[PDB]
Write a protein that binds this ligand. Structure first.
Ligand code: GDP
Ligand code: QPD
Length: 169
């Protein structure tokens, strides 16, 4: 049983916790503490491989930067989820990608761009914009919704494969 350590990083309010809890508790949480940083584990036999997923629902700000940067190094795959109805979170993608790349000191870092809230209206971030960015980074992008669980299943699976892809280069 192989263990995969992945961290869901992004802006606050994008739905980091809900997206993960949906695949852990099998239901959508309407109200959940945004400052909670818990780690959930899930075992799935994906691609004929029985692996154990180690995920961490980031809050946003830790007591010390070194503590936040700690799991930034141990993270093999990072799920970059943003809100299509919040352009502010989409622009922050540049900072995260650049920052985490520096922390690990690598240009080839397994990441998947995720556009949450695809089931909600008032979309300011067009799909093309997100896709354009993902194609420039050299990573995949899929729209998702924690409420309908659309794309979320694929996104999480893709991240694991991206990790494997990086470890089989
Ligand atoms: N309608 C809708 N709300 C979502 C979605 N994902 C998360 N939310 C809501 O966003 C708010 C914060 O969710 P939370 O799990 O704390 O995400 P986080 O704080 O960004 O890690 C809550 O009201 C969630 O129910 C979604 O996909 N669709
Ligand atoms: N945030 C935490 O619980 C940190 N430990 N856990 C982790 O790093 C991991 C938990 N889930 C992960 C997913 C991918 C990589 C790492 C982890 C932590 C932070 C500060 C001090 C001591 C421990």
């Amino acid at each position: 049983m192989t263990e995969y350590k992945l961290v869901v990083v992004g802006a606050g309010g994008v739905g980091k916790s809900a997206l993960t809890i949906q695949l852990i508790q099998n239901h959508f949480v309407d109200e959940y503490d945004p400052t909670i940083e818990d780690s959930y584990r899930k075992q799935v036999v994906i691609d004929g491989e029985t692996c154990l997923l180690d995920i961490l629902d980031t809050a946003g700000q830790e007591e010390y930067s070194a503590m936040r940067d700690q799991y930034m190094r141990t993270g093999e795959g990072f799920l970059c989820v943003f809100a299509i109805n919040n352009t502010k979170s989409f622009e922050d993608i540049h900072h995260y990608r650049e920052q985490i790349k520096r922390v690990k000191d690598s240009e080839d870092v397994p990441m998947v761009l995720v556009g949450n809230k695809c089931d909600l209206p008032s979309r300011t971030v067009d799909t093309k914009q997100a896709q354009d960015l993902a194609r420039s980074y050299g990573i995949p992008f899929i729209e998702t919704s924690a409420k309908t669980r659309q794309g979320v299943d694929d996104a999480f699976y893709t991240l694991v494969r991206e990790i494997r892809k990086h470890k089989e280069k």
